[PDB]
RNA sequence: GCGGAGAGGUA
C-alpha cells in the first residue's frame, strides 16, 4: 500500500503466511522451494546443532480456492536474524501486508460509464497483468468396493473415442501440466457389470474382439462443465491390499 | 425495434385484448396459413402484427369476417 | 500532506489539470488524481454468471 | 495558397525517450494532429513480443526449478517485458542457455542476426547452485495490439505439448505519449504553432518510423473518406 | 411441515417455481442503450435461446437434424452467431432484480448482444429497479409463446412503464450523473468567455462551445423558435430573442416541439428536470417522452464528463 | 422403439429402449451398435454396420413387421370443408403373393 | 500490419441540409479518433465567405432604433449572420441593400452582383412597416476559415474607427451543426469494432457529403508530408 | 449423487 497504517508488518508476520527465521544466521542456499541458512555461532546449539532449513509451499489450494504461494525475499549470503521475513506468503511483500494493489485513480464522471458505484478501468491494467489471480479447484474420483465387484481406474473405458484417452497416460490419469476444458475426462474409472448372461456366439465374439463383459459402463470423472485450466498436481491414496498405480 | 405500442392501444382502449388480437394475428402469420399485409423490414412476426395493428388494417372484427369468409 | 506533495514538486492542492484522452480538449475545473490502494474482491462475474 | 506541416528535428534524449517536432502547423490543427497521433500510436503500433516459451525441466507455468528463486510464472512475467526488435521474419526462436551461479539476464540470449535485444541488462532469473543449469527457447512474434492467452485458447490448434507455456502478447512498444502545441514564431507570420510529441517506448520502435506509420494509417482512413458512393 | 410453511410447499413450489430459459449475472451501466433495450452477453443469450437457434437453423437448412444443430451450437461457429442475431431481433427478454418490490421490478427489454459476462442495464430504469452498480445482480427470463412475447413487449416493456403505478409521477427521472451534467450545463456565471454575444440559434451555440470560442455556461442573447400546440393539435412557431446561457441553448436542441422554452431556462436541478419530464409527458404523450428521456440521459452524461467535476480536500 | 442417437459424423448409434416392440432383437444388444449409411464412412469406420436395403437389420425388421399384424388396422378422422359430412373413404391394401 | 478499412457508407439525407452518415466497419478505438478529427476540422477550420462588418446610413451604435422597423437592430444583425454567400473570383466584396414598401425584406432583395451567389434567396433580413419603409445598408463579406466572434476583434480595436462601424460575427464554415456518435459493431466474430454516425447540418450552400469531402481532403493535404508507406 | 442441516458471504 502506498498509504498504509504501519500495522501491515504486524499482520503479515503474525499470520502464518510468511516464512520467518527461528535461529538467526546467514542464507546458505536459496531456491524457489526452500531457504537453507547456516546458524550464527551465538545461537548455534553446542551439541548437535546443524543448520536450519525452511521448505516453502508453492501453489496449493486455500479454503476459498485461491492460491497460496511463497516467494523468497533474501539472496545468497545475506545475514538473517531471528524474526526476519525470509519468504513472502500470499499477498504480502517483504514482510508487509499487500492485500490488493495501488493504482492511479481520477475522480470524475466519464460519460456515465462510472454512473453508479461502478468503476472504469484502463486497458493498461489488464496489459500490465496486475489484477489476474490464480485459483485452484480440487476434484476427487473415488473408487470404492461394490459387491458386484470393485470399480477400476484403468484407462480402458467402454465406448469412449481415443481422443478422450489421448491426454491420459497408461495408468488412466491426466498428465501434469495438461490443459483441459469442460467435458474433458478428468480421470478414468470403469463401472462393473454383472449377470451379463451373454449368448454363446456372443461370448466367442467377445474373446476374439476383446470386448469386456465386466465393463460396458463408465464412471470416469470429467472436468465440470464450463471450467477450464491446467492440471498442476495429482495425488493418489490407496488403502491396504491395493496395488500402487504408475502415478503413485 | 418497435419501441412503443401507444397507437395500437389508442385503437383499442382496453390495452389487454389488444394483446389477444395481436397474438391471434401473429399466430396465423407464424404457422404459415396467412401472409403479412405490410412490407416486413426483417422484423419477427410479433412486431409485424403490432405494426399491422397500428396501421388500422387488422382488428378483431376483420379477423372474424376473414375467418368466416 | 501538502508538505509531502510540495517535496515531490506536485500541485499542493492535490488536483491536476487533465486532458480528455478521446477528444484532447481540456476538462474545466481540474480533477483529483492520485494513487489509491484498491482491491479485487472474490466476487468474480464469471463465477456469478 | 496554404501551408502544410513538415517533420522537423527529432531529438533523442535516451534510447527509450524521444521528442519529435513539427514546425509549420496552422492554427487549430495543433491539437487535432497531436491527438490523432497520440491515439494511433497508443493503439496501433506494430511490435514484436514473446508469445510462448518452452523451458526444459518444467511441465507448467506453476512448477518450480531447482536452483532458482523466482517461480516459473515469474519467469514468464519477466519475459513479457522483454523488448526485442525483429526485422525480417514473423516468428523467431531465441535460445537462452546459462549454467552456474549468477543472474541470467537478457544479454545471455543466443545472438541471432535478425533479432535485436534492446536491453541486455534486463534480468530473467538468478541461479543459486553450481550445477544448476537453465535452458529455454522463447518464441517471438510480430503483431499489433493486445491478445491474451485465454482468447487464443479457442484456436488452440494442437497446443498438445504440455511443455508449452503460453504468454499474453502485448504487441505494442509505446508506453506513454504526450504532446504540446506551442506558439511557432515563423519569421513572416503572426500566429503559428509547432507540435511537440514526447514519447516513451520500450526501445524497439524508432520514433521516425512510429510517427510515419501512424500518419500513414490516418491518411489511409482519410483516403477511405475521399470517395463517397451515394449509389 | 412439507405443505405448511415457507420452505415447504405452496410458497416454495406452487407460487415460487423455478422457470427454464433463465439466467443471472451482474449488472453494468451501458449508457449508450435505448430506453427499451438491454445489453445481453452472447453466451447467455445463446444458452437461453438454444431451442430457437435449433428451430431457425433447421428452417434455414444449415442442419439436417436436431442433433446436428446441437453439435453446431456446441462448436459455436459464425453461422450460429448470425442466426442468434437474427432471432434475437424483436424477441424481448424479462429483466428482474432480486427484491421485486413493485411491478417495475420486472420489465421487458430488447437485448443487444455484447461481449462480457455482465448484463447491461439502462441507467434511467435503475430507479425503478432500485438497482445500483456495486455488485447487484439481475435475472433474465425469456418469454416463449407468441402471447407471452406480445405481453412482454406491450405491458412490461420499459418504455410503457414510465409512470409509477402508486402515484402518477414519473419513475424514470434522471438520477445522479445526468442531473449533475444538466445542472452544470444550465447554471450561469457572471463573467466568462463570450459574455453577451448574440447567437442566431442553439446550433451556433454548439459551434462556439465545442470549438472553445465560448464557455459552456456564459450569459448570451439567442434567437429561438419555440413551438406551441395551442390550436387543436397544430404547432405554432413563436420566434424571439431570449437571454440565456450557452448551456441552456445546447440543452434545448433535444427538447421536442411542444414544450415552452421556459422549461430549460432555469438552474435545472433534480426537481426541475423531473417536472420537465412531467410536462413533456402531459403535453406530447408517450413516444416523445421516451425519446426525450433518452436524449436527456445522453446529453447529461456527455456534459458531466466534459465538466470534469471532482472532489478535492479543499472543495 | 429403438433410440437413435445422432453422434454427428455420419454415424448413428442405435440402442434399444424401454418401449421397444419385440422380445429380443436378433442383431441388437443393450449396449447398442453404431451404423453408417455412407459406404466411405463404413470403409473408414469398420466398427459400424453398413446399412443398405439388403442389410440384415432392415430385412429382419421387415420380416418382423410384415409377419406380425401391427399396422394392419387403424381408424382416422378427416376435417375437410370441401367434402360432404359422414362420407366414407376406405384404404384397402391387398397383397399379391 | 493489415488494417480494417470501412465499407458500407450509408447516408440518410432527411431534409437536404441535414444528413446522417453511418460507417459500421472499423478498428477498435478509431471511432473517436477519426470522428473527432473530422468534427473539429469541419467545425473550426473550413474556408468560406461571410458578412464581417456593416455600416448603417442611419444609426451610429448597435442599440439605437430606426423608425418604422418593429424588429430591433440586434435582430437585423442576427439575420445578417445567417447569410450564406459564395463568391467565385473576388476575395472581399461589398453588397448593398436598399428596400422600400411593406413586407419582409429578404435576402433576394439584395442587388444582384456578378461573382456572388446567395444560396438561400428566401432568408428573411428585415421587416418594413407602412408609408415610410426606408431601409438602406452596405454589408461587406470576406473569405476566411472557421468562426470568428465579434469580441476577439473588438478586443484588439485600439485603431479607433469612426462611429457606426458595426462588427458582425463571421460565419465562414458552411457547417451549422456537427456531431458524431460511436457505437458497437461486430463483424460476425470480432466485436470490438465500432460504427460512426455523423449527423451534419449545413447552411444550404454545399450539401453535407461534399462538406465532409473537402474536410477529409484538407486533412489529408496537411498529413501528406509525412505519410510515405504506400 | 436428487436432498436437508450447520457456517459464511452478496444485494
Ligand atoms: N439486509 C439487506 C441489505 C440490503 N438489501 C438490498 O440492498 C439494497 C439496499 O439499498 P440501500 O438503499 O440500503 C443503499 P443504496 O441503494 O446503494 O443507496 P446509498 O448507498 O447511496 O444509500 C436494496 O435493494 C435491498 O433490497 C437487502 O435486500 N437486505
Ligand atoms: Mg447495489
Task: Indicate the proportion of strand residues of chain A.
Answer: 15-25%
Tell me the major beta sheet of chain F.
Answer: 4 strands, mixed
- What does the radius of gyration of chain F come to? 19 Å
Name the CATH architecture of the domain at 1-64 in chain F.
2-Layer Sandwich
Largest interface: D-G, 41 and 38 residues
Strand proportion of chain F, as a percent range, falls in: 5-15%
The largest sheet of chain A has its strands arranged as 4-3-2-8
Number of helices of chain A: 4
Structural class of chain A: alpha+beta
In this structure, how is the largest beta sheet of chain A organized? 4 strands, antiparallel
Structural class of chain F comes to alpha+beta
What's the oligomerization state?
A: part of a larger assembly
What's the CATH C level of the domain at 1-64 in chain F?
Alpha Beta
Function (chain B): Promotes RNA polymerase (RNAP) assembly. Latches the N- and C-terminal regions of the beta' subunit thereby facilitating its interaction with the beta and alpha subunits.
Keywords (chain B): DNA-directed RNA polymerase, Nucleotidyltransferase, Transcription, Transferase
Family (chain B): Belongs to the RNA polymerase subunit omega family.
GO molecular function (chain B): bacterial-type RNA polymerase core enzyme binding; DNA binding; DNA-directed RNA polymerase activity
Summarize the structure.
This is part of a larger assembly, with two copies of chain A, one copy of chain B (69 residues), two copies of chain D, one copy of chain E (315 residues) and one copy of chain F (97 residues). Chain D has 231 residues and is an alpha+beta fold. Chain D has helices at residues 29-44, 72-80, 149-152, 207-226, and strands at 7-12, 17-25, 47-55, 84-86, 91-99, 102-105, 115-117, 123-127, 133-143, 145-147, 165-166, 169-171, 174-183, 193-201.
Topology:
The structure is cut from a larger assembly and holds 2 copies of chain A, 1 copy of chain B (69 residues), 2 copies of chain D, 1 copy of chain E (315 residues) and 1 copy of chain F (97 residues).
Chain D: E1 7-12, E2 17-25, H1 29-44, E3 47-55, H2 72-80, E4 84-86, E5 91-99, E6 102-105, E7 115-117, E8 123-127, E9 133-143, E10 145-147, H3 149-152, E11 165-166, E12 169-171, E13 174-183, E14 193-201, H4 207-226
Antiparallel strand pairs in D: 1-2, 2-14, 3-9, 3-11, 4-7, 5-9, 6-8, 10-12, 13-14
Helix pairs in contact in D: 1-4
Chain E: E1 22-28, E2 37-41, H1 42-48, H2 50-59, H3 66-75, H4 78-88, E3 93-97, E4 106-114, E5 119-120, H5 126-129, E6 137-141, H6 146-156, H7 177-186, E7 198-199, H8 202-210, E8 219-228, E9 236-245, H9 246-252, H10 270-283, H11 286-307
Parallel strand pairs in E: 1-5, 2-4, 7-8
Antiparallel strand pairs in E: 1-6, 3-4, 3-6, 8-9
Chain F: E1 3-6, E2 12-15, E3 33-36, H1 39-44, E4 49-50, H2 56-67
Parallel strand pairs in F: 3-4
Antiparallel strand pairs in F: 1-2, 2-3
The complex binds the ligand Nc1ccn([C@@H]2O[C@H](COP(=O)(O)CP(=O)(O)OP(=O)(O)O)[C@@H](O)[C@H]2O)c(=O)n1 and magnesium ion (MG).
Chain E binds one RNA strand of 11 nucleotides through residues 97-99, 131-132, 134-137.
PDB class: transcription/dna/rna
Keywords: Post-Termination Complex, PTC, transcription, TRANSCRIPTION-DNA-RNA complex
Entry title: Escherichia coli RNA polymerase and RapA elongation complex
Amino acid at each position: 500500500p502506498l498509504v498504509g497504517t504501519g500495522m501491515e508488518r504486524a499482520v503479515a508476520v503474525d499470520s502464518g503466511v510468511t516464512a520467518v527465521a527461528k535461529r538467526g544466521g546467514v542464507v546458505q542456499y536459496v531456491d524457489a522451494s526452500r531457504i537453507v541458512i547456516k546458524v550464527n555461532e551465538d545461537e548455534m546449539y553446542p551439541g548437535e546443532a546443524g543448520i536450519d532449513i525452511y521448505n516453502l509451499t508453492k501453489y496449493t489450494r486455500s479454503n476459498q480456492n485461491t492460491c497460496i504461494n511463497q516467494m523468497p525475499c533474501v539472496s545468497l549470503g545475506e545475514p538473517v536474524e531471528r524474526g526476519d521475513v525470509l519468504a513472502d506468503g500470499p499477498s504480502t511483500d517483504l514482510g508487509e501486508l499487500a492485500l490488493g494493489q495501488n493504482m492511479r485513480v481520477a475522480f470524475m464522471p466519464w460519460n456515465g460509464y462510472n454512473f453508479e458505484d461502478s468503476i472504469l478501468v484502463s486497458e493498461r491494467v489488464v496489459q500490465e497483468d496486475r489484477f489476474t489471480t490464480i485459483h485452484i479447484q480440487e476434484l476427487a474420483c473415488v473408487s470404492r468396493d461394490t459387491k458386484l465387484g470393485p470399480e477400476e481406474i484403468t484407462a480402458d473405458i467402454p465406448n469412449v473415442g481415443e481422443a478422450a484417452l489421448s491426454k491420459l497416460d497408461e495408468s488412466g490419469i491426466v498428465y501434469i501440466g495438461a490443459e483441459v476444458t469442460g467435458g474433458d475426462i478428468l480421470v478414468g474409472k470403469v463401472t462393473p457389470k454383472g449377470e451379463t448372461q451373454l449368448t454363446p456366439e456372443e461370448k466367442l465374439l467377445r474373446a476374439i474382439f476383446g470386448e469386456k463383459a465386466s465393463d460396458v459402463k463408465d464412471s470416469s470423472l470429467r472436468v465440470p462443465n464450463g471450467v477450464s485450466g491446467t492440471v498442476i498436481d495429482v495425488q493418489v491414496f490407496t488403502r491396504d491390499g491395493v496395488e500402487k498405480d504408475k502415478r503413485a | 425495434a418497435r419501441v412503443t405500442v401507444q397507437d395500437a392501444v389508442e385503437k383499442i382502449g382496453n390495452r389487454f385484448d389488444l394483446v389477444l388480437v395481436a397474438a391471434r394475428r401473429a399466430r396465423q402469420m407464424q404457422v404459415g396459413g396467412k401472409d403479412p399485409l405490410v412490407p416486413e423490414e426483417n422484423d419477427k412476426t410479433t412486431v409485424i402484427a403490432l405494426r399491422e395493428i397500428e396501421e388500422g388494417l387488422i382488428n378483431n372484427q376483420i379477423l372474424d369476417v376473414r375467418e368466416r369468409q | 500532506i501538502k508538505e509531502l506533495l510540495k517535496l515531490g514538486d506536485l500541485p499542493t492542492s492535490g488536483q491536476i489539470r487533465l486532458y480528455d484522452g478521446r477528444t484532447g480538449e481540456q476538462f474545466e475545473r481540474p480533477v483529483t488524481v492520485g494513487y489509491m490502494y484498491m482491491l479485487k474482491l472474490n466476487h468474480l462475474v464469471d463465477d456469478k454468471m | 495558397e496554404f501551408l502544410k506541416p513538415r517533420l522537423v528535428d527529432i531529438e533523442q534524449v535516451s534510447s527509450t525517450h524521444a521528442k519529435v517536432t513539427l514546425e509549420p502547423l496552422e492554427r487549430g490543427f495543433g491539437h487535432t494532429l497531436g491527438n490523432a497521433l497520440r491515439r494511433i500510436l497508443l493503439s496501433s503500433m506494430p511490435g514484436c513480443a514473446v508469445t510462448e516459451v518452452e523451458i526444459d525441466g518444467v511441465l507448467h507455468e506453476y512448477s518450480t526449478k531447482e536452483g532458482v528463486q523466482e517461480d516459473i510464472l515469474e519467469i514468464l512475467l519477466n519475459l513479457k517485458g522483454l523488448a526485442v526488435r525483429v526485422q525480417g521474419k514473423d516468428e523467431v526462436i531465441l535460445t537462452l542457455n546459462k549454467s552456474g551461479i549468477g543472474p541470467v539476464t537478457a544479454a545471455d540470449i543466443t545472438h541471432d542476426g535478425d533479432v535485436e535485444i534492446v536491453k541486455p541488462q534486463h534480468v530473467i532469473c538468478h541461479l543459486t547452485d553450481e550445477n544448476a543449469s537453465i535452458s529455454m527457447r522463447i518464441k517471438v512474434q510480430r503483431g499489433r495490439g493486445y491478445v491474451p492467452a485465454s482468447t487464443r485458447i479457442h484456436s488452440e490448434e494442437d497446443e498438445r505439448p504440455i511443455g508449452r507455456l503460453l504468454v499474453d502478447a502485448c504487441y505494442s512498444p509505446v508506453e506513454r505519449i504526450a504532446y504540446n502545441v506551442e506558439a511557432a514564431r515563423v519569421e513572416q507570420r503572426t500566429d503559428l504553432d509547432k507540435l511537440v510529441i514526447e514519447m516513451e517506448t520500450n526501445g524497439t520502435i524508432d520514433p521516425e518510423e512510429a510517427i510515419r506509420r501512424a500518419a500513414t494509417i490516418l491518411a489511409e482512413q482519410l483516403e477511405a473518406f475521399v470517395d463517397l458512393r451515394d449509389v | 411441515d412439507m405443505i405448511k410453511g415457507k420452505q415447504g410447499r405452496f410458497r416454495q413450489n406452487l407460487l415460487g417455481k423455478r422457470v427454464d430459459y433463465s439466467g443471472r449475472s451482474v449488472i453494468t451501466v451501458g449508457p449508450y442503450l435505448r430506453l427499451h433495450q438491454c445489453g445481453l452477453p452472447k453466451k447467455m443469450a445463446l444458452e437461453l435461446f438454444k431451442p430457437f437457434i435449433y428451430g431457425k437453423l433447421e428452417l434455414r437448412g444449415l442442419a439436417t437434424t436436431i442433433k446436428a444443430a446441437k453439435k453446431m451450437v456446441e462448436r459455436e461457429e459464425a453461422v450460429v452467431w448470425d442466426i442468434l442475431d437474427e432471432v434475437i431481433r424483436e424477441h424481448p427478454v424479462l429483466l428482474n432484480r432480486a427484491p421485486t418490490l413493485h411491478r417495475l421490478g420486472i420489465q421487458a427489454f430488447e437485448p443487444v448482444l455484447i461481449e462480457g459476462k455482465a448484463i447491461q442495464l439502462h441507467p434511467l430504469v435503475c430507479a425503478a429497479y432500485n438497482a445500483d452498480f456495486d455488485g447487484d445482480q439481475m435475472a433474465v427470463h425469456v418469454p416463449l409463446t407468441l402471447e407471452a412475447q406480445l405481453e412482454a413487449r406491450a405491458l412490461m416493456m420499459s418504455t410503457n412503464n414510465i409512470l409509477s403505478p402508486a402515484n402518477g409521477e414519473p419513475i424514470i427521472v434522471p438520477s445522479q450523473d445526468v442531473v449533475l451534467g444538466l445542472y452544470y450545463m444550465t447554471r450561469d456565471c457572471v463573467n466568462a468567455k463570450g459574455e453577451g454575444m448574440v447567437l442566431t440559434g442553439p446550433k451556433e451555440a454548439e459551434r462556439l462551445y465545442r470549438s472553445g470560442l465560448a464557455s459552456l455556461h456564459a450569459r448570451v442573447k439567442v434567437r429561438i423558435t419555440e413551438y406551441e400546440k395551442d390550436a387543436n393539435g397544430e404547432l405554432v412557431a413563436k420566434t424571439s430573442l431570449k437571454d440565456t446561457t450557452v448551456g441552456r441553448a445546447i440543452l434545448w436542441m433535444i427538447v421536442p416541439k411542444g414544450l415552452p422554452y421556459s422549461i430549460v431556462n432555469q438552474a435545472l436541478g433534480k426537481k426541475a428536470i423531473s417536472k420537465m419530464l412531467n410536462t413533456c409527458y402531459r403535453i406530447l404523450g408517450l413516444k416523445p417522452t421516451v425519446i426525450f428521456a433518452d436524449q436527456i440521459m445522453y446529453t447529461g452524461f456527455a456534459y458531466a464528463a466534459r465538466s470534469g467535476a471532482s472532489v478535492g480536500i479543499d472543495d | 422403439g429403438i433410440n437413435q442417437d445422432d453422434r454427428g459424423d455420419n454415424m448413428i448409434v442405435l440402442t434399444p429402449s424401454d418401449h421397444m416392440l419385440v422380445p429380443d432383437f436378433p442383431g441388437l444388444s443393450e449396449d447398442g451398435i453404431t451404423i453408417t449409411f455412407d459406404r466411405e464412412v463404413a470403409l473408414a469406420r469398420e466398427d459400424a454396420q453398413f446399412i443398405t436395403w439388403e442389410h440384415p437389420l432392415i430385412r429382419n425388421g421387415l420380416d418382423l413387421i410384415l409377419s406380425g399384424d401391427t399396422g394392419s388396422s387403424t381408424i382416422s378422422l378427416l376435417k375437410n370443408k370441401a367434402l360432404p359430412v359422414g362420407t366414407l373413404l376406405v384404404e384397402l391394401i391387398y397383397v399379391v403373393e
